[PDB]
Amino acid sequence: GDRINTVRGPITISEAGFTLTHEHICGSSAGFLRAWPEFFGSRKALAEKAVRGLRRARAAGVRTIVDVSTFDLGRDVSLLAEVSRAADVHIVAATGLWLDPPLSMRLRSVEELTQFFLREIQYGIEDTGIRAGIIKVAITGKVTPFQELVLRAAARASLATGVPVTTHTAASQRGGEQQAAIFESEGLSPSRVCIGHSDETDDLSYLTALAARGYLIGLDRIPHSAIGLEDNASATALLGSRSWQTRALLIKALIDQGYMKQILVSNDWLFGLSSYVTNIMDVMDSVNPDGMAFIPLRVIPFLREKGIPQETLAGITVTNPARFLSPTL
């Protein structure tokens, strides 16, 4: 209602400041960082890379990130707490399930998954005492049966705690409509929900219609735009063919439609990525050397020069995330 849980404990809403609402310290798999830290050079090297990256974002104005790495993205909340303390950047951790659930998760009922998401919000993650402040879910296509169980569990956990739900939309086909239908069938308010990766489409009438229904629209992959990398087969299905300015103009378009309050922006960046081909992190870092500072260093000035006023940009990067993250029923 007024305090948000972070990996260093509770903070008040006013302390969050400029908040990147969809980021990762490391995109990995459950148990992997512990079992094979040398994949990333070392745990130390990954930690140090993340502390520099977060200090760079901080110098560019960022005060909070939301790490939307779930259990099955290899979330290590102890790593997050360490790099949060060393960078002096708040990190909100997530519960939920992404697209790589192991069997022990895939074979669970909606009731069982609700208890798991609830334990991570109400009690803590693992034995750390660190509580999730957001629930992350993911869909592909028209939403599979298991993904629908996960969305319903996420809705039920949200209804019991007030923490919001944020999604990974992996579809070339108005992928939020089915997510909205499932959330609404559960009695969840759209204002507790961010439909993420909404910048992957140019379908403005679709985005506007979700915003008018009260959903938050995550324009959160703005720098995933590889202009010149058609020699790499795997760099096209993880970056793209539309320019970053094209994606950023969706922000202006929704503002002009009257829905600035429904917009959340971010980079979807990370400092390590083992859940993809080897050396992918080198390709990503060469295409976007700004990392998580891309939003404040590139996108905010781009929008300013297009005529968006300062107060509107503050509304999007400070006010909207605060309203979204503060637990509410």
Told to check if 5 binds a copy of itself by CB under 8 A, we report no
- Quick check: 149 and 182 in contact, CB under 8 A? no
User: Is 197 labelled as part of a ligand binding site?
Assistant: yes
Give the span between the Cα atoms of 202 and 242, in whole angstroms: 9
Choice between 11 and 137, CB closer to ligand CAC: 137
Contact 248, 303 (CB under 8 A): yes
CB atoms within 10 A of CB 309: 11
Binding flag, residue 218, ligand CAC (CB under 6 A): no
Please state the closest distance from residue 185 (CB atom) to ligand CAC, in A: 25
Alpha-carbon gap, residue 266 to 296, rounded angstroms: 9
Shortest distance, CB of residue 27 to ligand CAC, whole angstroms? 4
27/327 with CB nearer ligand CAC: 27
Nearer to ligand CAC, 32 or 110 (CB): 32
Q: How is residue 297 written in tokens? A: 């260093």
Q: Using the rule CB under 8 A, is 31 a contact of a copy of itself? A: yes
Return the number of other C-beta atoms located less than 10 Å from residue 307's C-beta.
10
Cα–Cα distance, 67 to 77 (Å, whole number)? 10
Q: What's the gap between Cα 307 and its chain centre?
A: 27
Site for ligand CAC in 256-315 (CB under 6 A): 268
Residue number, 200 or 260, with CB nearest to Zn ion: 200
Give me 17's structure tokens.
């400041």
Q: Which of 63, 136, 168, 298 binds ligand CAC (CB under 6 A)?
A: 168
- The residue number with the shortest CB distance to Zn ion is 168
Check residue 223 for interaction with ligand CAC (CB under 6 A).
Answer: no
Closest separation in Å from C-beta 183 to ligand CAC: 19
Question: Between 102 and 141, whose beta carbon lies closer to a copy of itself?
Answer: 102
Q: Can you tell me which of 8, 52, 119, 242 binds a copy of itself, judged by CB under 8 A? A: 119
Write down the least CB distance from residue 268 to ligand CAC, Å.
Answer: 5
* Binding-site residue ranges: 22, 24, 136, 168, 197, 268
Q: Which residues bind a copy of itself (CB under 8 A)?
A: 28-32, 34-36, 38-39, 71-72, 74, 100, 102-105, 107-109, 112, 115-116, 119-120, 125-127, 274-278
